[PDB]
Write a protein that binds this DNA or RNA. Structure first.
Ligand SMILES: [Zn+2]
Ligand SMILES: [Zn+2]
Length: 93
DNA sequence: TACCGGAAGT
DNA sequence: AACTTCCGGT
């Protein structure tokens, strides 16, 4: 009985609340964001999905799977920085 | 330590 | 399917 929330939706959720700006913030006005506190975001994700051993290593692997899906891409040469391929298009399905 | 995609588990 | 868990190579 966990949250049916998706990982990219969960990130979008954190990005909506100022309370989480210290751990994840927007770095552009076109979908780019940065995991300021990557392990903290990962622990939060594990609590949500009920995976106590969740860490940034495995969360990042999930993000890498989004490259193929064209949901999220990596911002090359910028640690912890990623970009939503089509934000906010992904919010008006 | 970050990032990457293959392979297998849930 | 959408991750989760490992692994070895850049
Ligand atoms: Zn639209
Ligand atoms: Zn390794």
């Amino acid at each position: 009985m966990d949250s049916a929330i998706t990982l990219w939706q969960f990130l979008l959720q954190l990005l909506q609340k100022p309370q989480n700006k210290h751990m994840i913030c927007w770095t552009s006005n076109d979908g780019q964001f940065k995991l300021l506190q990557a392990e903290e975001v990962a622990r939060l994700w594990g609590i949500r999905k009920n995976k106590p051993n969740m860490n940034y290593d495995k969360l990042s692997r999930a993000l890498r799977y989004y490259y193929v899906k064209n949901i999220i891409k990596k911002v090359n040469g910028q640690k912890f920085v990623y970009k939503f391929v089509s934000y906010p298009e992904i919010l008006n399905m």
